[PDB]
Amino acid sequence: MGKLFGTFGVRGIANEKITPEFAMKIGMAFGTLLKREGRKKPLVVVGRDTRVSGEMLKEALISGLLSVGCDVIDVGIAPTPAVQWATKHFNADGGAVITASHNPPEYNGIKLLEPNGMGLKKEREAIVEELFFKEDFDRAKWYEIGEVRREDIIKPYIEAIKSKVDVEAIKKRKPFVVVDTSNGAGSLTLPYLLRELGCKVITVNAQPDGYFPARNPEPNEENLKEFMEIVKALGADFGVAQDGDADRAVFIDENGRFIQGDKTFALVADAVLKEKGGGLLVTTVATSNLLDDIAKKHGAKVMRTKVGDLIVARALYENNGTIGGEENGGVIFPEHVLGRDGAMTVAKVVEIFAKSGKKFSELIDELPKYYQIKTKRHVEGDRHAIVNKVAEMARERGYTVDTTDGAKIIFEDGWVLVRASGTEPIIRIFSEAKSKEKAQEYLNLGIELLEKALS
Ligand SMILES: [Mg+2]
């Protein structure tokens, strides 16, 4: 995936690409990097999700770390954001999460973390890859081999989230929430957090089980078809579903309607920015203008970064941003953890709901309305130079083009984005407007320029 790592960690099938030797070498390379950066005895936090191959890979990874002189805190099974939270909490020099997130049961992987818990920086990850391939490890002398201890972080993590919201307000309202944790790591946290916040809680698939009996742990609309019906059948105020490692949270309103991630992101940013009375919202060039509206509303600045994992988190961190998020939501609360944390998002949404005196559907529908369309066209060759041409033309034709990440034709009412995938031979086309008509027009405008660029 870039020789070793992908956008945020590496994954593959357990015992094929992701073997114990693989996990052990990753631990030895990471530990060696930590020592060469100037640490005599690094402290590394290690956690994992509910996958069946997790224990075996965790032992291999930890064995590697101890062998190169690093002390280890094994936090056991916990949501990825909890492991990131714990890395910062224990003042560790780094962290590692054994997980393949939303993938089928046979998959697993590893995510490395900075001392503050955020995804490992690319420059440091480059060194880890290099040490991994060369097997250039600084093995400890016998009397410098690291030690490992276990820490249970479930209660501390839940308490850290609760301290961030108005629990009395929530208990007063007593929202009725249904939650599906997809047999994942969130099974150990979200149901308990919701009850402690003061909610009436019903759960679906909340028994931790790496076999993922309910379904592959990916909360897309297709997979939640039954869950949505259950939300409506129970007459709950709303429903929430998480992916396997629980970094994501997907919301369903009282009518069983699947809510788009950017809407709950807007809902949370609105409350957060109002609280600070301004600040800085960080998101990508592909996120809805709805977020610009929320930011303006509170006099907050907006930063639009390229699309991709860790980019928003890194920008939030480097610019002391207030709140961050992306196209599909994935809200990042800087004061909590510099990483997407669906449990924190749910807590904040529960608080907003409890204070609104409205129905979940109303909170969503009351937000500025926008319409968007998407398309993907197969393109080979210098797929990227093709997008550059679309930009030139657009500009030549009098169009305002933003080339932060691809070709984004900017209108007053909306926009059109022509961006080339960084992995697959595709050059997707996204559009948004305040009406289906304009969205369609803008979309076609993009397709038009694309084709003439391909001829
Ligand atoms: Mg995930």
UniProtKB/TrEMBL annotation:
Query: Needs which cofactor?
Result: Mg(2+)
Keywords, in A-Z order:
Isomerase, Magnesium, Metal-binding, Phosphoprotein
User: What GO molecular function annotations does the UniProt record carry, in alphabetical order?
Assistant: metal ion binding; phosphoglucosamine mutase activity; phosphomannomutase activity
Family per UniProt?
Answer: Belongs to the phosphohexose mutase family.
Biological process, per Gene Ontology: carbohydrate metabolic process
CDD domains in the record, alphabetically? PGM_like1
Q: Does the keyword Transport apply?
A: no
Q: Which residues form the Alpha-D-phosphohexomutase alpha/beta/alpha domain?
A: 3-137, 156-256, 261-370
The cross-references to NCBIfam families, in alphabetical order and at most eight, read: Arch_GlmM
Q: Where does Mg(2+) bind?
A: 101, 243, 245, 247
The record's listing under SUPFAM superfamilies reads: Phosphoglucomutase, C-terminal domain (SSF55957), Phosphoglucomutase, first 3 domains (SSF53738)
State the InterPro entries in the record: A-D-PHexomutase_a/b/a-I, A-D-PHexomutase_a/b/a-I/II/III, A-D-PHexomutase_a/b/a-II, A-D-PHexomutase_a/b/a-III, A-D-PHexomutase_C, A-D-PHexomutase_C_sf, Alpha-D-phosphohexomutase_SF, GlmM_arc-type
Protein's UniProt name: 455aa long hypothetical phospho-sugar mutase
Sequence ranges assigned to domain Alpha-D-phosphohexomutase C-terminal in this UniProt record: 390-442
- Report the domain of life of the source organism: Archaea
Q: Does the keyword Transmembrane helix apply?
A: no
